[PDB]
Amino acid sequence: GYSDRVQQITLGNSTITTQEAANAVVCYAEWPEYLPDVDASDVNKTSKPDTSVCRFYTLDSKTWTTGSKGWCWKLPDALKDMGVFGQNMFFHSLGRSGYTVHVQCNATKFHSGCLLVVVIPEHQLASHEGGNVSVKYTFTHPGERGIDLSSANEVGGPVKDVLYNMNGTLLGNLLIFPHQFINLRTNNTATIVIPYINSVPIDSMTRHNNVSLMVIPIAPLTVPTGATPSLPITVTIAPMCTEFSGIRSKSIVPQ
Amino acid sequence: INYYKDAASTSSAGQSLSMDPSKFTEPVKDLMLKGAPALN
Amino acid sequence: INYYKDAASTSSAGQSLSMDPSKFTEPVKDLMLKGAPALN
Amino acid sequence: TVASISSGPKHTQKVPILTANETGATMPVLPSDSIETRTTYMHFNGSETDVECFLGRAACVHVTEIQNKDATGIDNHREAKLFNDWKISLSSLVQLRKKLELFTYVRFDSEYTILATASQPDSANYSSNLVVQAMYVPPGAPNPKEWDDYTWQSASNPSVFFKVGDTSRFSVPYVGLASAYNCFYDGYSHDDAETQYGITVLNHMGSMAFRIVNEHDEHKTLVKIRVYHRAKHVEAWIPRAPRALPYTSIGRTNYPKNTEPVIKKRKGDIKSY
Amino acid sequence: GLPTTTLPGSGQFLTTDDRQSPSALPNYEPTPRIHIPGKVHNLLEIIQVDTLIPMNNTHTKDEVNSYLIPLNANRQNEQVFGTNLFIGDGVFKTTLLGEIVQYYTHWSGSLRFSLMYTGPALSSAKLILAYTPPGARGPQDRREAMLGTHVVWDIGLQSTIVMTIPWTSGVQFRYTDPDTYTSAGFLSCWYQTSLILPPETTGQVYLLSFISACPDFKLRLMKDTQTISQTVALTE
Amino acid sequence: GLPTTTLPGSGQFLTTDDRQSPSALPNYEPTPRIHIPGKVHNLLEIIQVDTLIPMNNTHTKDEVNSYLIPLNANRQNEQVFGTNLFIGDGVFKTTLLGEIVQYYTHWSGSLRFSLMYTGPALSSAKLILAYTPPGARGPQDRREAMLGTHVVWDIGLQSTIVMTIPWTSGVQFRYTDPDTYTSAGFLSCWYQTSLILPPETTGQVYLLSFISACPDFKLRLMKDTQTISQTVALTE
Amino acid sequence: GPALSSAKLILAYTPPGARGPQDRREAMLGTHVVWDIGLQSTIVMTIPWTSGVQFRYTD
Ligand SMILES: Cc1cc(CCCCCOc2ccc(C3=NCCO3)cc2)on1
C-alpha cells in the first residue's frame, strides 16, 4: 500500500509528511555524503553539529497569484539566519552541505496551475544593465526573502526576466537541471535532495552560493469560480551532512 | 609512442565509451519501472 | 634513444627525488628529539 | 547492437506510454512501445559526440596585433603596439565559448597554435624575416614595459620564438587552482559590498605577451597574431541550458537590453505546418 | 643522418588533427581531481533528457506563454496544433535537442514527443496525436490524420503521454538544417472526443509539450551552429 | 628515403623544451667530481630552514632594527604586532621563503612562524599568538584574536616558540602574488599577562621572529621574480 | 473538513526554556511535523520526553 504518493522525511527533530508527492529527485543521482580524506585539503578537523543543523527550516511563505513571475532563493544564503546553522556559517572560515528541499502548494480538484521547481548549480546571474555591469553582493544575497522575479529592476541588482533564467538561457531548457513540477491536478509538493557540488572540496559559505532553488509558475494559476484568486507556496529546506571548518572570529558581511 | 615526457603533451584522449544518461534522465529516488503506473 | 655519442648531448636529467633537508635544518652535533626539552 | 527489436500487436494492462512528467524523469520510451517494429541494428557508436571530440579541435580564441617600427621617441611602447599582451582568457571570442558553457566545470590540457602573418600597408621594399617572441607572463611576474626590457630575458618563464608566417605550437597542462575550471561562479572574491561578481575574479590566469625580436627596417610592418586553442584530455561536469541571447562581456552572463525575440514566430497559426 | 622526403601538406595547420606537442611547463603538477556529481561523457547522454518546446510560437516577443498549448472545452473533431518535423528549425530550434542537433550535420533516430496535461483534476479529455511520414501533406482533418502513426491519449491520473516518432526513412540519415529530400513528416493533434470542464470552472486549460531523443539516435559530422555569432571580440 | 610530413611548430625555439644536441667538443673529458659538503637537490629542501622576518618594517631606511619586535614591561591586554599573510609581499618578501615563493606562481602548505625571546633571564612574560583564517578581519583585540588558531606562549628556559599556520583553505592552491579570493588570513600577537622585568633592569626587550615552510608545502608553475631587474647589460 | 478541501498545518513542540512561540518562524525551530491533510485523516505528533530532571510534578 506504499504509494509513490505518500512520504515521510524525518531529519533531526523535524518531520514532514506529504500525502500527494510525485516521487523525489536526487540530483545527478547522488545523495549528500561527508568529505572524504582522499579529497581533503585543509588540515583542520571539521565540526559536524549533526542534528542541531540538519533539521528542516521553513522559510516565510510566498503568494502565487495570476500575475506571479517566479521566485529565486540561493543556498546557503536562504538559511544564513536559521538557528545554529546560521551561526556556524558566520563563525567558520569554510563549511560544506547538501540539502533536502521540500516545496509545498495545495489547492483543490477544481484549480489548475503548474510550477517548475528546479535546482541550478552555480547560477551566475546577469546584470539588467548589459555590458559588464556587475550584480552587487546584497542583490545576490536576498536571505530568506529570496528574489521576486516580478519585482522591479533595481540598480546593482540582477535582471528578473523569466524567459531567460536570469542569465541568457531559455526557460524551456531548465529541465536539463534536477527539477520536479507541482501540477495542482497531480502533485502538491516537490522534493529534491541536493548533494554538495563544487570544484573545491569545501568553500566559503558567504562569498559563494552553490545552488539557486527556483520556483516558477508555468501554467498560470486558475482558480474555480469566485474562488480567491491566489494560493500560498511554502519552501522548507534542511541542511544535510553539514560540516564546518576553520573556526574563528565571525564574519562581517556587507549590508 | 610518446616522444615527450609530460602527460599534457600527449594527443587527444580516446572515447569514453562510458555513456549513462540515467543520472540526467532518471534521477528519481524510488525507481520507476516502464509499464508500471507512474503514481501508485 | 641517444642519437649522439657524448654525454653532454643528452637531454635534461630526471628528478633527484633525493631530498634531505637535515643537512640544512638540523646540523646539530647532539641529536635533538622533538618533544624532548631543547636544553637539558 | 539492436536499434529496434521486432514487436507485434499489444492489448495489455501494462502501458509504458502513460507517465507522470511531474516526477522529473524522462522515461525511456521506444518506438516499439507504441507501434509494431521489425529488427534493425545501430551500425553506429556515438564516437563523434564524445566530449573529448566535441571540445577537441582548435578554435580561434584571440587575434591581436603588434608592429615593428622605430621606437625612437615612443613614450609608450605598449601603446604603440611595439609589443602587446593579452590577458589570457577563453571567453573573449564567442564560438568556442557557447560550446564550453554547455557544462559548469571543465578540466583539460590546452594545446595552443599561434599563427602570425605580416602586412605592409605603406608601399614597401624588402621585408626582412621577423621573429616573434611569445612569452607567458603569470600573475606576479615583472610585467614588461618596453619592447626590449630585462623581462624579455625570460630566464624562468616559458617563451617560444618562431617566424612570422610560420606557426608555433606547444601544450600547457591544466593550470587551474581548483579541481576544474569554473565555467560559472555565483560568488565574489570576498564579502565586500562593491567587489566584482562572476568568474573574472576566479580565472586569474595572468596574461600572454608578444613582441618582434627584430630591430626596425626602413618601412613599418604590421604583424597580426591569431591564437588557437584545442582542449585535450577533457572532463566536463553538470550540463546546463545552452546560451540563447548574445554575449556582452568576458565573464559575465549579461545579455544586451532590447535584444530580439530568440524564438522564431510562426507565419500562421498554432495549427500551421 | 637518416634520408627523408617531405610530402604535400608539410607545414599545414589543420584545426582537427591530433598530435603530440612539447609541454611549456615541464614538470608541473596539476591539482588533484576531487569527485563532482554530474559528469557528462557524450552529448548523446544529454539529448535524452526532455525539455519543453515553445510550440505556441504565435506571440510577438518571447514569452512564457509560447510554451503553453491551449485547449478549448466542448470543441469536437477539431485540431489542437500542427508543426513539421524540421528538428533544426522552427519550434524545435531552441530546445536542448534542437540546440545540439545544430552542432552536427546529419541525424538519424527516433524522437520522443510527450504532452503533460495541466487542467483541473475533475475535467477529462481524449486527444489523438498523429505522426505523418514524409510523402503526404500535413493532415487537414483527423480522418486524414488518423491514417498514419497515432496514439489516442485518455487524460487521467497519469498526467503525461509519450508519443514516439519512429524513424521512418528511405535514406538512413537526414540533414539537421531543413532539406526537402531529407524531410521527416508532420506532427498534428486533434480532439478525439473533447475537453470537458467540471462545474464552477472555466476558460482554457493548457498542455505542456516536451521533446527528447530515443536511445536510437545518431548525430554525425560536427559543424558550427547558426545559433550564435558576434561582431567584435568581447572584453572584460 | 622515408616519407615525412612536418607539423605546425616546426622550427620554433621553446625555452622550456628538453632535447638532445650535438656536442661542440667531441670527446672531451670533464674534471673528476670530488666530494663537497652541502649539495642541494630541491628548493623544497632549503625553504624549511628558518630565517628572520623584518617584522618591524616601520623604519625609513633598511636597518638591523626592523628585525627586532619590541616588548614593553607592564602593559596588559595590548597588541604586540600584526601582519597579513601574503607570503610573497610585505614583511615576508625578503625572507628566504618569501624570496623563493616568488619564483613560483602557486603555493599550498603549512607555514612555521616562531618567536625567540631575548629579554634578561630574570624577566617573565606570557604572550598569545593568533592565526585568523581567511574570512574575518585582522583581529582588533585579544578577545577577537583568541577565537581562532592561537598558542599561549610562556617565556621560559626554552627560548623559542614555534607556531604553525595550518593550511586552512577551500581552494587547494593560493597565488604567491597577493590575491583576494586566494588570501590566507592574518597573524597577530598580544600580551596574555604581561612582560615583567627584574629589578635593576630597564627598557624594551625584543623578540626575534623567523619563518620557514612545513614539510607539507608545495610550490608550482615557475615564473620570473619581481625581485630583480636591470637596465643595461653588466660588463667586467 | 469536506473531502474536496486541502490544508497543510505545522504542529510544534517547544521544549522548556524558551517562551511559547510567537510566529511560525519561531515555532518551526523546535520539534515540529508538517501535516498534509489527506486521505489519512489523523496525524500523530509525539512530544518526546525532553528533560534534565527525570521526573516532573503533575501539579
Ligand atoms: C576556463 C579557462 C581555461 C583557460 C586556459 C588556461 C591555459 C593556461 C595558461 O595558458 C598558457 C598560454 C600560453 C603559454 C605559453 N608559454 C610559452 C608561450 O606561451 C602558457 C600557458 O582559460 N580559461
mmCIF file of C-alpha atoms and ligand atoms in Angstrom, chain D residues 86 88-91 100 106 108 110 112 114 134-136 157-160 168 170-176 181-183 199 203 205 208 229, chain E residues 24-25, chain F residues 14 16, ligand 1:
data_model
loop_
_atom_site.group_PDB
_atom_site.id
_atom_site.type_symbol
_atom_site.label_atom_id
_atom_site.label_comp_id
_atom_site.label_asym_id
_atom_site.label_seq_id
_atom_site.Cartn_x
_atom_site.Cartn_y
_atom_site.Cartn_z
ATOM 1 C CA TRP D 86 46.796 39.524 -23.811
ATOM 2 C CA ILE D 88 44.574 35.264 -21.139
ATOM 3 C CA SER D 89 41.074 34.131 -21.200
ATOM 4 C CA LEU D 90 38.954 31.805 -23.340
ATOM 5 C CA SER D 91 35.682 33.570 -23.174
ATOM 6 C CA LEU D 100 32.252 25.266 -23.254
ATOM 7 C CA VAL D 106 35.538 21.671 -17.260
ATOM 8 C CA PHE D 108 41.537 19.816 -19.777
ATOM 9 C CA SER D 110 45.460 23.042 -23.708
ATOM 10 C CA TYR D 112 47.961 26.366 -28.361
ATOM 11 C CA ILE D 114 49.850 30.645 -32.810
ATOM 12 C CA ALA D 134 55.673 34.838 -27.182
ATOM 13 C CA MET D 135 56.144 34.829 -23.731
ATOM 14 C CA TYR D 136 53.874 33.715 -20.882
ATOM 15 C CA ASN D 157 59.205 31.999 -17.815
ATOM 16 C CA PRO D 158 58.494 29.744 -20.793
ATOM 17 C CA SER D 159 58.834 31.630 -24.097
ATOM 18 C CA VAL D 160 58.703 30.435 -27.734
ATOM 19 C CA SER D 168 54.237 27.938 -33.068
ATOM 20 C CA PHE D 170 53.150 23.854 -27.626
ATOM 21 C CA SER D 171 50.766 22.498 -24.938
ATOM 22 C CA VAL D 172 50.273 23.656 -21.311
ATOM 23 C CA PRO D 173 48.977 21.290 -18.593
ATOM 24 C CA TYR D 174 45.711 22.174 -16.783
ATOM 25 C CA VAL D 175 46.846 25.205 -14.768
ATOM 26 C CA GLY D 176 43.660 25.767 -12.718
ATOM 27 C CA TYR D 181 37.886 25.493 -14.187
ATOM 28 C CA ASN D 182 34.531 27.125 -13.254
ATOM 29 C CA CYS D 183 32.563 27.953 -16.405
ATOM 30 C CA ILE D 199 34.372 34.334 -12.661
ATOM 31 C CA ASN D 203 40.165 32.767 -13.669
ATOM 32 C CA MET D 205 45.444 33.157 -15.194
ATOM 33 C CA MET D 208 50.478 36.366 -22.556
ATOM 34 C CA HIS D 229 43.199 26.642 -28.524
ATOM 35 C CA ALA E 24 55.623 24.636 -21.960
ATOM 36 C CA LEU E 25 55.503 23.850 -18.224
ATOM 37 C CA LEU F 14 60.664 26.996 -26.861
ATOM 38 C CA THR F 16 61.453 25.073 -21.905
HETATM 39 C C1 LIG H 1 38.423 28.409 -18.377
HETATM 40 C C2 LIG H 1 39.748 28.697 -18.993
HETATM 41 C C3 LIG H 1 40.731 27.797 -19.427
HETATM 42 C C4 LIG H 1 41.736 28.547 -19.900
HETATM 43 C C5 LIG H 1 43.063 28.265 -20.491
HETATM 44 C C6 LIG H 1 44.174 28.236 -19.451
HETATM 45 C C7 LIG H 1 45.547 27.966 -20.051
HETATM 46 C C8 LIG H 1 46.694 28.065 -19.089
HETATM 47 C C9 LIG H 1 47.637 29.236 -19.358
HETATM 48 O O1 LIG H 1 47.825 29.337 -20.798
HETATM 49 C C10 LIG H 1 49.098 29.447 -21.320
HETATM 50 C C11 LIG H 1 49.198 30.155 -22.517
HETATM 51 C C12 LIG H 1 50.422 30.324 -23.125
HETATM 52 C C13 LIG H 1 51.582 29.784 -22.550
HETATM 53 C C14 LIG H 1 52.872 29.967 -23.217
HETATM 54 N N1 LIG H 1 54.152 29.579 -22.704
HETATM 55 C C15 LIG H 1 55.173 29.878 -23.552
HETATM 56 C C16 LIG H 1 54.362 30.508 -24.669
HETATM 57 O O2 LIG H 1 53.011 30.515 -24.380
HETATM 58 C C17 LIG H 1 51.475 29.081 -21.355
HETATM 59 C C18 LIG H 1 50.252 28.911 -20.741
HETATM 60 O O3 LIG H 1 41.405 29.849 -19.779
HETATM 61 N N2 LIG H 1 40.115 29.918 -19.189
#
